[PDB]
Amino acid sequence: TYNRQNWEDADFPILCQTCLGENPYIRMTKEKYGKECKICARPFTVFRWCPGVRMRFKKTEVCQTCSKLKNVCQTCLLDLEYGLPIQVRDAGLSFKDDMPKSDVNKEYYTQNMEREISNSDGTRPVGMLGKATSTSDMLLKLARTTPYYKRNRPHICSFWVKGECKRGEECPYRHEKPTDPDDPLADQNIKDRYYGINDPVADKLLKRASTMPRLDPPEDKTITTLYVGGLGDTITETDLRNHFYQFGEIRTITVVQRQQCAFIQFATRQAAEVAAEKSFNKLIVNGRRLNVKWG
Amino acid sequence: DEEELNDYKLRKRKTFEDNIRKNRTVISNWIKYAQWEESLKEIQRARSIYERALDVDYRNITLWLKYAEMEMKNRQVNHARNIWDRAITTLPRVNQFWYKYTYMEEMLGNVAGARQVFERWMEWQPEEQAWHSYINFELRYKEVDRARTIYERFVLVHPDVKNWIKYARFEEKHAYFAHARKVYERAVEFFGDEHMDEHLYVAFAKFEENQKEFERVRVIYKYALDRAQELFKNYTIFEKK
RNA sequence: GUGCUCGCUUCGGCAGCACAUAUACUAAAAUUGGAACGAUACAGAGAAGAUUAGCAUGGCCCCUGCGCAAGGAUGACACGCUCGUGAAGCGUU
Ligand SMILES: [Mg+2]
Ligand SMILES: [Mg+2]
Ligand SMILES: [Mg+2]
Ligand SMILES: [Mg+2]
Ligand SMILES: [Mg+2]
Ligand SMILES: [Mg+2]
Ligand SMILES: [Zn+2]
Ligand SMILES: [Zn+2]
Ligand SMILES: [Zn+2]
């Protein structure tokens, strides 16, 4: 009769670079027990700020325990290291973690993980980060590098949609047309985005990543000789030999500047496959980028 | 039929959870819930049920026994090894855990390195059946110097006249007559030297009668001079032979 | 915006100086999910004859109450564990 979820009261929120904005001087507001968590339904310390000039006054949505558990932002619900949905990262690494959906089991599991984290060092996304050591499979290809500030854009003025926004240019909300309501990208359940179940953004990025054969190769009839284009005279056979020395023993390494192709062949099929996958539009040696294909 | 089976499983799980919540300390509800989950081929659900029951009361022998038997009845051998390691490290004085761990790692496991694991039990000074089973296990693995060290530690840890007689019989059966004579001499020098047990002297006289009848007659005369009716019977047997 | 210039110099203004320096859960909304328990219907008041006073005990069951009080049908809910068959280990033959 004396078990309940403890209230998470802590400073220093864990946010992305994009949602934090671009100004080095940010004015910041904190409520001690302002709102509830959007997932585990516990009260938590709510942080609110304006990321920039014409932004939305973004505020934290989920509690710090859930965000430390899934290694995501407290507002964007995207991964801190890569800026991806957690469904995409779970498809990349491991999807056997899961979480309960019924509220009593969810509160019990969250209390157990909170006690485990509080008995730990304090800032560690459990052993899942231990399963996150293997990386750069395909997630680095579609990961953003620039801060996408267009998701800090303000909301659409509903009075302007009906054509009755009497504020005009004084209205801070957007006086532009919204997205298509018939589009299935516009559903976006928050619990579905947190749990990584049927998120349409994750499905669209998985379909986009599946159409980019950056690790396919294998266009030769059991021949290890593959041609990497884009090398030219800038990349010589020494860089190809240094790249193939990690795979073991190389059968042949050569570079031809007449066709600007590096011919790489290995005595092992697995080493030649790894050398073709590493050089398929992802290898840069001596200032020259190589794309692997049949030769 | 799938929806009816799901409703039946939901009703059975609701009644099992209500029986758990009504009386938490009654472990038979936990055992029945875990066996019903194992009968529906849900290994991880029954493992979670058993882990919850061990969190409720870890001192029960039957919870560990049933959860290790459920791990061993399936193909989860390493899970059963982890379960037995936890059961040994929490409850070392329960010999049934040791016996079933050694039968699991000896018959099904067939690993000789489990004998090194068995040496962990030899840190705990168990009852004499553990020493006898380890003697017979080292004989089944065809080791006699190791079994000599085992029986020497058995004599040092649990000294008894029957233990010294078993050491003499094991040294005689392993074709080490000089070691058997030295063990009989050490047993005469230490075990009942002033207590006058008059039973290790009879075994030494029997070993000498197997070896040389003059030393057997001398041992029978020394036993008759040191002393019962059995010593007089042994002296009459030595005089008749 | 106010006030003043060893101003430019018209008498209007420019220029400079000084003061004044960061509101908003930013909506007059669009949305979204939860529901009093009233109508009907299901429904039917503990203790081995009947009519019944009750106090508890347990917790992912609550309500009225300012309650460490008292009520809510005792607030409701909360029963079935002495011989053989095999297997393993131990000692004798
Ligand atoms: Mg009655
Ligand atoms: Mg009363
Ligand atoms: Mg009462
Ligand atoms: Mg009453
Ligand atoms: Mg009454
Ligand atoms: Mg009552
Ligand atoms: Zn963010
Ligand atoms: Zn939370
Ligand atoms: Zn507007």
Per domain, the residue ranges of chain B are 1-241
How far away, in angstroms, is B22 Cα from ligand 1 center? 27
- Give the number of other Cβ atoms within 10 Å of residue A222's Cβ: 6
Positions of chain C reached by protein Cβ under 7 A = 22-30, 58-61, 78-79, 81, 88-92
Using DSSP's 3-state secondary structure scheme, residue A8 falls into: strand
Give the CA A22 to C1' C21 distance in Å: 21
Give the CA A48 to C1' C18 distance in Å: 38
- DSSP state, residue A142: S
Solving technique: cryo-EM
C-alpha of B43 from chain center: 30
Ligand closest to CA A165:
9
Instruction: State how far the Cα of A47 lies from the Cα of A60, in Å rounded to an integer.
Output: 6
Give the CA B119 to C1' C7 distance in Å: 106
How far away, in angstroms, is A94 Cα from ligand 8 center? 21
B53, amino acid identity = A
Q: Which nucleotide is nearest to B28 (CA to C1')?
A: C81
How far away, in angstroms, is A5 Cα from ligand 3 center? 30
How far away, in angstroms, is A37 Cα from ligand 8 center? 5
Q: Taking the CA atoms of B222, B223, B229 and B235 in sequence, report the sign of the dihedral they define.
A: negative
Nearest to A190 by CA among A94, A76, A57: A76
How far away, in angstroms, is B44 Cα from ligand 5 center? 49
Written as one string, the DSSP assignment of chain B is -HHHHHHHHHHHHHHHHHHHHH-SS-HHHHHHHHHHHHHTT-HHHHHHHHHHHHHH-TT-HHHHHHHHHHHHHSS-HHHHHHHHHHHHHH-TT-HHHHHHHHHIIIIIS--TTHHHHHHHHHTS---HHHHHHHHHHHHHTT-SHHHHHHHHHHHHHS--HHHHHHHHHHHHHTT-HHHHHHHHHHHHHHTTTTTT-SSHHHHHHHHHHHH-HHHHHHHHHHHHHH--HHHHHHHHHHHH-
B12, two tokens: 């059975």
Nearest to B50 by CA among B62, B40, B41: B62
Instruction: Identify the bridge partners of residue A290 per DSSP, sorted by sequence position.
Output: A283
The residue length of chain B stands at 241
How far away, in angstroms, is A165 Cα from ligand 9 center? 4
Give the CA B67 to C1' C76 distance in Å: 37
List residues with CB under 7 Å of strand C. Answer: A 1, 3, 27, 31, 34, 50, 55-57, 104, 154-159, 164-167, 171-173; B 17, 21-22, 24, 28, 99, 103, 129, 132-133, 135-137, 166, 169
In the numeric block, the tokens 């980019």 are attached to A212
In the numeric block, the tokens 């009879």 are attached to B202
- Give the number of other Cβ atoms within 10 Å of residue A214's Cβ: 17
Give the CA A112 to C1' C75 distance in Å: 34
Instruction: State how far the Cα of B224 lies from the Cα of B238, in Å rounded to an integer.
Output: 11
- DSSP state, residue A255: E
How far away, in angstroms, is A148 Cα from ligand 9 center? 24
Give the CA B156 to C1' C36 distance in Å: 81
Give the CA A132 to C1' C57 distance in Å: 52
The answer to whether the beta carbons of residues B180 and B207 sit under 8 Å apart is yes
φ and ψ at residue A35, rounded to 5 degrees: -120, 175
Cβ contacts of B224 within 8 Å, gap of 6 or more: B231, B232, B234, B235
Q: Which nucleotide is nearest to B24 (CA to C1')?
A: C58
Q: Which nucleotide is nearest to B129 (CA to C1')?
A: C90
- Give the number of other Cβ atoms within 10 Å of residue B124's Cβ: 12
Instruction: State how far the Cα of B167 lies from the Cα of B6, in Å rounded to an integer.
Output: 63
> What distances in angstroms separate CA B122 from CA A189, B43, B92, B119, B151, one per listed residue?
60, 34, 11, 5, 12
How far away, in angstroms, is A148 Cα from ligand 7 center? 10
The residue length of chain A stands at 295
Give the CA B32 to C1' C91 distance in Å: 38
Cβ contacts of B115 within 8 Å, gap of 6 or more: B137, B138, B141
Torsion of Cα atoms, B148 then B149 then B150 then B153, to 10°: 120
What dotted CATH number matches A225-294? 3.30.70.330
